[PDB]
Amino acid sequence: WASPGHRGCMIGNNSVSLLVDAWMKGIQTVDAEKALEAMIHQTQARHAEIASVGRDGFEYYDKLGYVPYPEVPEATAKTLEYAYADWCIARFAESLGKQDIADQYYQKAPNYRNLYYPEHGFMWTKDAKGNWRDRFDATEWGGPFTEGSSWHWTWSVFHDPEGLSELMGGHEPMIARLDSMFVAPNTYNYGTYGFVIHEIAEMVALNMGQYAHGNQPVQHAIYLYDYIGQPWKTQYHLRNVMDKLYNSGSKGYCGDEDNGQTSAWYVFSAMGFYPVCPGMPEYAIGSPLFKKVTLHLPEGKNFVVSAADNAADRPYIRKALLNGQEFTRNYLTHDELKQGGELNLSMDSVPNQQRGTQPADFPYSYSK
Amino acid sequence: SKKTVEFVDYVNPLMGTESTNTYPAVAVPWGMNFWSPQTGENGSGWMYTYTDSLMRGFRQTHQPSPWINDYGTFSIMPLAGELKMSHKERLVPFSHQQEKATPYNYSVTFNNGLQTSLSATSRGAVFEVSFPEKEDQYVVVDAYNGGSSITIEPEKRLVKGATRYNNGGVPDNFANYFMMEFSHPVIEYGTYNGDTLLHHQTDVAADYTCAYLKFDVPAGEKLTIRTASSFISPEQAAINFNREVADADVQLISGKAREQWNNYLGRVEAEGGTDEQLRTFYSCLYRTLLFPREFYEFDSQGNPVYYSPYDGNVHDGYMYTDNGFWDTFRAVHPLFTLLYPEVSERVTQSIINAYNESGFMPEWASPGHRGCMIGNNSVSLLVDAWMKGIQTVDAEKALEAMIHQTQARHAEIASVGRDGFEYYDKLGYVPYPEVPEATAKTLEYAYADWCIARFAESLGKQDIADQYYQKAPNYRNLYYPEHGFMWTKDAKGNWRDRFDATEWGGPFTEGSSWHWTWSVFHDPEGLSELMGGHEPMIARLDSMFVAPNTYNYGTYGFVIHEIAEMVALNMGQYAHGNQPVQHAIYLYDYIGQPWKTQYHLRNVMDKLYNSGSKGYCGDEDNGQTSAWYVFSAMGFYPVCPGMPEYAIGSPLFKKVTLHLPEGKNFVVSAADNAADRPYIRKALLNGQEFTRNYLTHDELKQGGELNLSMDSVPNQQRGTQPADFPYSYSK
Amino acid sequence: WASPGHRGCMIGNNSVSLLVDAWMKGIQTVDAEKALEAMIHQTQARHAEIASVGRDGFEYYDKLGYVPYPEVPEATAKTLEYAYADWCIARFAESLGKQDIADQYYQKAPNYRNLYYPEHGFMWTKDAKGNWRDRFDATEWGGPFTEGSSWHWTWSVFHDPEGLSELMGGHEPMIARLDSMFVAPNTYNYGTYGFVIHEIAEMVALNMGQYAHGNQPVQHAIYLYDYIGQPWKTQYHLRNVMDKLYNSGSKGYCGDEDNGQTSAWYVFSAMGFYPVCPGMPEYAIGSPLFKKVTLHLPEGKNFVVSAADNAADRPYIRKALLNGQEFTRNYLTHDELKQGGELNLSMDSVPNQQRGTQPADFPYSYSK
Structure with a gap:
């Protein structure tokens, strides 16, 4: 926690996560040996006064x-x-x-x-x-x-x-x-x-x-169903949460425990995918909120999540094409988004209990 | 006397099947083998779930709950088009709109148009299958994992096998031996050992085994499948098969199961209530007549015998299983003592048999001793029956078994003893x-x-x-x-x-x-x-x-x-x-305020029950309250099994008639009953003023009539005296 | 606790409060030396048998x-x-x-x-x-x-x-x-x-x-906002409680923990003020229920709380005159009531956040 300098607040060594998640996605602007030294030290020592540092x-x-x-x-x-x-x-x-x-x-x-x-x-x-x-x-x-x-x-x-x-x-x-x-x-x-x-x-x-x-x-946690055989549950609960705990008004984040720290969660979930585990360059698939989102990425690449029949009563993914090819995995890789292209989804008002239930899909x- | 709408017509076996627990059992009362559609994976206690849309097979099952899980189980799955062997891959879409579930017959039409229905006897079943035209026609037999085998005799249209899957509580030589026969010639066939599909092979044994048969039923004809099984031997399975299902079609087995359910359900006639109330009542009653199951069979001489799940030998007499007494002593067995005492006669015997065969009376059994729950409620069953005149066990032997259950404990199973x-x-x-x-x-x-x-x-x-x-x-x-x-x-x-x-x-x-x-x-x-x-x-x-x-x-x-x-x-x-x-709701009867019992009971029946798929709405109710509802709707409840008394509640219908042994009948009439009239203003027992908050077993048993005047306000003078408690x- | 004589029930030395509250208000019919002696003994001793005594x-x-x-x-x-x-x-x-x-x-x-x-x-x-x-x-x-x-x-x-x-x-x-x-x-x-x-x-x-x-x-507790700069909150919650947890029927006290012991609280709160700290001759100001209350006190004096604009949706005090003088304090003294006069309130449907937030007002x- 930094405001401006070291502040004693919360827990963890998630400094490490930022560095590694960026690294494994090819963002590499720091010296490798120095970074590793910093990470290891962060787990092998602690600031004398501030418990959250180290x-x-x-x-x-x-x-x-x-x-x-x-x-x-x-x-x-x-x-x-x-x-x-x-x-x-x-x-x-x-x-x-x-x-x-x-x-x-x-x-x-x-x-x-x-x-x-x-x-x-x-x-x-x-x-x-x-x-x-x-x-x-x-x-x-x-x-x-x-x-x-x-x-x-x-x-x-x-x-x-x-x-x-x-x-x-x-x-x-x-x-x-x-x-x-x-x-x-x-x-x-x-x-x-x-x-x-x-x-x-x-x-x-x-x-x-x-x-x-x-x-x-x-x-x-809602994205965990993608890992254990029932992505339709992810789709249902995410869409429910987006419709019920959010609005653009002054109250805004109605979750009792939500004070606005869920903003990035909402942007990702609305787009249809979420980084469950930073450090692994993958995004678990949920359910998109819009008929279309276009991501404008570096080097003139664009990735589209298309859901032309999306509607409030249609949270389920019945079928999907990734760049024209049938797609049943419950995740997209960072490389898949980076290179641009399209994930084309057919939305439905009932779950497709045959899709994404296999070990290869997790x-x-x-x-x- | 035949009616347009019969008792069994009120039963919804899907009650309790959503928010998942329950499966829609095709059976006869206390039948040795049940049948059910299966939507969950092999091995899962969640065998059928209302929200699932893909079917994997029709299971011969013994499962008393998802936690306890199954044993002696195999499945049959007709398929159209593509052949799939493993339960992991047999997933066939269907809609509840093309599903008709009854105790005497389950029928379903898949999205591809394949239609199948099945009906059960005590130990067997018969299927009819209508295949979609112009598609390959298969039946797959899944004999489960745990070390199973299957043998096909295609020229005879026969398949036999053994399934050994279980979740504990079985002797070392455990197996269910099954047999089935098809009406039409088997054109092709093969076996599957969990790894490879072997076309043309007739004989297979491995951890997990399946077999397929391929048919060519002509347009307009239906395939019939007859099956039966035994825990004793393949010979005995054939005996069960020939007695119960040989030469039958599904309509014959359906008609007989239907008649059996009407006979047993009709021992209590509820009248003057909504269709919803009748469905709830009879659905709970149906659930109550399923467990414990009969575990005995009739040999070539027609005498009752059984594979003991306690010592693994074959014995003469009776055996029952798939019951936790911690659950069922409270209301299920008391219901039997009253309306089906011939069952309690054999159950009490079976308890002593298990004691003779294992050293302890059972508490949770499936099939044999299982480590589950607490108490010595096996005692309650023996004693409750005894004080009601059901005395088929030897007194000294029963007493010795009771004392021992309280003075010893199984070396590894805490719940036993x-x-x-x-x-x-x-x-x-x-x-x-x-x-x-x-x-x-x-x-x-x-x-x-x-x-x-x-x-x-x-x-x-x-x-x-x-x-x-x-x-x-x-x-x-x-x-x-x-x-x-x-x-x-x-x-x-x-x-x-x-x-x-x-x-x-x-x-x-x-x-x-x-x-x-x-x-x-x-x-x-x-x-x-x-x-x-x-x-x-x-x-x-x-x-x-x-x-x-x-x-x-x-x-x-x-x-x-x-x-x-x-x-x-x-x-x-x-x-x-x-x-x-x-x-607990009945406790007001003991302390001077029966009107409170009357009020709360009628509130619970109205608010926490319906006959639909989520029918037990109580958060802590997964269907274990079936017998509580049956008693409560009739107007009385066995608060203390072992004391032949039933505490008086408030009846749900304008009339119930209990048909008891020896041509006796007991009527609880409440002619002015209604949703807003839960209170008993006045009562007559066989024409005499009646202010007690209980009926004795003998008062019910000898036949007669409790006449209740129901009211929208409580009568605070009635049932308040110590003589009334x-x-x-x-x- | 007395019924008729000493009864072992509850806790505290609140007999002291009755005496001191009355005394500081000029009610003095007991002997001062005797009263103080009894008060002190009440804190320096306990009944051998009855815990609540002493x-x-x-x-x-x-x-x-x-x-x-x-x-x-x-x-x-x-x-x-x-x-x-x-x-x-x-x-x-x-x-x-x-x-x-x-x-x-x-x-x-x-x-x-x-x-x-x-x-x-x-x-x-x-x-x-x-x-x-x-x-x-x-x-x-x-x-x-x-x-x-x-x-x-x-x-x-x-x-x-x-x-x-x-x-x-x-x-x-x-x-x-x-x-x-x-x-x-x-x-x-x-x-x-x-x-x-x-x-x-x-x-x-x-x-x-x-x-x-x-x-x-x-x-x-609802009156504590008067002490810490936000009397409009006391005003809102107080009126809310009076409207929602009371009525004159057989179930009149609707509060789940309320079996009738709040009847004095209601009487004071409807009048517009409450004795938060007996022993201190002050009453914290809340929000009156009626367009008008007149208290007939000894020596022919009358004290009036008028709220001519009062209404169910007007629980807030916008402005107040005490005896014609602009008044921003969040309490009245016993002396101010005793001597007779008038607290003239202007009620509003929105809080006045400038009023009664100064230290001199607490x-x-x-x-x-």
């Missing part, structure tokens, strides 16, 4: 496989962020040909596993001696978590959704845990009143918010 | 954190012990009865007086820190103290003694059913009244369908 | 500056009520001219600071050795609190709102916390389907009840 609790983390709590505040959210940063450093070292270093950091990429509580099916916390903290509670804020609860932080495994599903027992349980976050309106037998009862019911579920739109660690995970 | 019995005997409760789910366990054990005491008492064994009655008040040991709820203690008597009524897990099972505190069905009076008296108990109950608060918004009219109720539910203080509180141990 | 935990409180928990039940609520009572005794002693005794008791007036938990922003609890209790939770009822949680009891500082705001970090933080107590209806984008949507949304929040009208410790606080 890696708070790095010693425990290198020794134990996780940051412990209560020894270190917000230890579990930190652990989860460090694991992703370490994966980023591994990617970087590997692309430079420094395989031994890459392997050292790849060995840390799965540290998220060290805090998964199998009995409960969520992330949790342990002390320095390996004891789970007492009285598991999925909705308890604070302590080992930052700006959220296990309910949120459990999904913070962007580099390895597949590994997260394995912890959870497979694609099916993960899908069920994911579905439970987007509580559906329950009108019981009151429908008699018509669409009206249906609308109010939706409002109330939201007021409730199993899903906190705008909460950082779950911003990418985007990246460390454990695939 | 009594987890934590040492502590419980020494301390008067099961301690936590030493034993998981200790408090719920204590509460269940106290009830089981009360059951055993009642049983010994009825035999004359007063010494043994006194020992167990000593334990019946053990629930008192976990009541925390400072907070007025059940809680938990460790082995040294220390209360657990930071009491929280709403905290789930730990010493509780699938609930919190908010739910479990009510789990004292053998002693409501005693529970009220803990709480301070009837008055405080009433206030506490009142607090569970949060009423709508509209404030000054009513101005906006009654529309304001409707939305308010959703919310009051939408936060769920009483979680309808949560096991330990299923009886049902049983409590501490009275 | 001061439960007085030894700890004198020695530590708070009542500890788990040593003493309801210790935090007790500490806050005691600090207020001691402040009352200081005021009494001071007006009698006994400065040494007043100074002793003023010493204890700020004891509420001793249980404020800075890391969390709320009142909490400590044991005898000074350790904060584990697992902080603002919504947790019971234990150290009485008939409420920290959410309610954190506001229980009637004699020093300015001081309470210092603890929170300033007027601004305190305002934000106050604001969060009155959850505003969120209708997202459904306003599209009419004002009715708006009505339902308000029920839901109340059904939510973040502010528990009738919970004693927060009864005065009512009493011990640390002012």
Whole structure:
């Protein structure tokens, strides 16, 4: 966090993510050795006064496989962020040909596993001696978590959704845990009143918010269905969120936890794709908001997301062509966009449950 | 007497199939083998989901729930056009608009125009298939993974095989042996071993196996497929096949299943209610007549035999399975004791058989012992039946099995026997954190012990009865007086820190103290003694059913009244369908305010049920409340199995007639019933003024009539006297 | 608590408040030396049998500056009520001219600071050795609190709102916390389907009840905006409560936590003012319900609150004349009422944000 200089705020080593995400997309304006030194140092030291500068609790983390709590505040959210940063450093070292270093950091990429509580099916916390903290509670804020609860932080495994599903027992349980976050309106037998009862019911579920739109660690979560066999659910929930939690008025971001930090999330989602895991040059596909978006890219290249039959009642992708060729992958690569061309989508009011359900269609995970 | 609209016509097997749990079982009551369309992958407990649009097969299934999952399962899938072997690839689009699901027949037409329907007998099934013209015609047989085999005899139009897939609870020699026959010549055929499709091969055995047959049915003709299976042997499968389905077409098997459902469903006749209410009633009844399943077969001599899922041998007599007693003791088996006692006769026997075959009575069984849930509720089934005159087991043998269930535990399966019995005997409760789910366990054990005491008492064994009655008040040991709820203690008597009524897990099972505190069905009076008296108990109950608060918004009219109720539910203080509180609404009957029972019951029936795909709307209701609805709609409920009494609620229809054994009939008539008239103003039992809040089993059994005058306001003089209250141990 | 005689019920030394509030208003029919003796004994002793009689935990409180928990039940609520009572005794002693005794008791007036938990922003609890209790939770009822949680009891500082705001970090933080107590209806984008949507949304929040009208410790809370620069907020919320949680029917007190104990609050609030801190002869100004109220006081004096423009959609005070003189203070003294006269209010449908935001406008606080 910089305003203007170092400020003590939040957590993580996401400085690493900026450098590596840009690097793996071919944006390379810094010295490679200096960058790697800076990254490694960022994980092997910490500012004497400012906990957010460098890696708070790095010693425990290198020794134990996780940051412990209560020894270190917000230890579990930190652990989860460090694991992703370490994966980023591994990617970087590997692309430079420094395989031994890459392997050292790849060995840390799965540290998220060290805090998964199998009995409960969520992330949790342990002390320095390996004891789970007492009285598991999925909705308890604070302590080992930052700006959220296990309910949120459990999904913070962007580099390895597949590994997260394995912890959870497979694609099916993960899908069920994911579905439970987007509580559906329950009108019981009151429908008699018509669409009206249906609308109010939706409002109330939201007021409730199993899903906190705008909460950082779950911003990418709707896109996870692309990784586990059901992209139609991604399409449905994204379009619902765009229609219901946003407007151009003074209130603007109506999500209770959204204070405007979701702006970039909305631009990407409206275009139809989202970078679930920066450092991997891929964008998971959601569902476009408009009939057409044209991206004007460097060197006179243009990429078009075309959805000529898009409509408010048509969030689903029935079929897709990428540059005239049938396309069933649930992601576009950065190279695919960079070179220009077109993704042509046929929108529909019902899900196509045959499309994008195969392993070849899923985007990246460390454990695939 | 034949009617235009018959009982089975009201059943929607798709009820409970959306928001996914349930599959639309084609079956006869308690049938050994069920059949169902399959939309989920092989291996998935979510076999059929209403929102899925692609079908993979028609499964012979035994699955009692998604969590427990299946065993002894294979599938048949007719295909038109392209041949697909693996369940991963057999995905055929269809619409619910071309689907007709009934208990006696399931029929569906795929988007490609292929039509298929199937009907089941107890152990077999018959399919008819109409193939689209000018397309290749196939049937694929999927025998599942886990080590299976298939043999095709194409010149005889036969396929046989064995499936061994299971989710535990099976002996080492487990298998289901199946057999099927096709009406038309098999033109081509092949096998699949999970890796390769082998054309022309007739015999296959591997982890996962499938076979295909290719036909050439002439335009205008339909393919018939007949199938049956056995857990005993291929010989016995052929015996089942020849007795139940040989030479039959689908119309014949459909007609017989239809008649069986009307016979069994018709044992309770509901009249004077909406079509929606009739559909809800009969759909719940249908669900209630499915489990436990018969697990026996009739040999060449016509005598009942069975493959024991407990010792893997074949025995003479009866066996049932696919039941968790923790679920079904509360209302499912009590319904059987009343309306289908010939089933309870064989079930109780089967419990002793499992005990003889394994050393313990079952608690969750599928097929054999499975580690699931808690309690010794097998005892409840034996004892409830016994006090109702159903006595097919030997008394001494049953008593010995009961005592042992409370004095021992399976070496690896915690739910089999009594987890934590040492502590419980020494301390008067099961301690936590030493034993998981200790408090719920204590509460269940106290009830089981009360059951055993009642049983010994009825035999004359007063010494043994006194020992167990000593334990019946053990629930008192976990009541925390400072907070007025059940809680938990460790082995040294220390209360657990930071009491929280709403905290789930730990010493509780699938609930919190908010739910479990009510789990004292053998002693409501005693529970009220803990709480301070009837008055405080009433206030506490009142607090569970949060009423709508509209404030000054009513101005906006009654529309304001409707939305308010959703919310009051939408936060769920009483979680309808949560096991330990299923009886709780009836507790007002025990403490002087039956009108509150009448009101809340009728509210729940109106608001949390419908016959559609999301029919169980209670957030905590996945269909386990089927029998609760059936009883409640009839007007009474078995709050305490083991005591032959039913607490009186408020009936949903203008009339129900129960057809009981020996030509006896019991009528609950409420001629002025209506949606706004839930209260019982007055009652006559066989013509006599009746103010009790309960019927005894004998009063129902001997036949007669309960005549209720229903009203839109409560009658606050009726059923308020101590003579009116049902049983409590501490009275 | 008396019915007829001493009954063991609730907490505090609020008998002291009755005496001191009356005394500072010129009601003096008791012997001063005897009254002070009784007040002091009430804080320096406790009934052997009945906890609510005298001061439960007085030894700890004198020695530590708070009542500890788990040593003493309801210790935090007790500490806050005691600090207020001691402040009352200081005021009494001071007006009698006994400065040494007043100074002793003023010493204890700020004891509420001793249980404020800075890391969390709320009142909490400590044991005898000074350790904060584990697992902080603002919504947790019971234990150290009485008939409420920290959410309610954190506001229980009637004699020093300015001081309470210092603890929170300033007027601004305190305002934000106050604001969060009155959850505003969120209708997202459904306003599209009419004002009715708006009505339902308000029920839901109340059904939510973040502010528990009738919970004693927060009864005065709506008036705290008068102290920190934003009386229009007091005006809005007050009128909102009167309109929505009251009626004259059998269910008249609609507040979920309101069983009739708020009837005096309604009477004062409808008149336009409220005694936030008994013992200080002032009344914080709210917003009147009627076009006119006339109070007939002793010696033939009448005090009138006129609001000739009052209406359901005009809860705001735009301008005020007190006895014909421009008036911007957010309180009236007892003397101003007693002597007779008129407060002439001009009501409006929008807030006047220039009025009553100056320090001279704020009512009493011990640390002012």
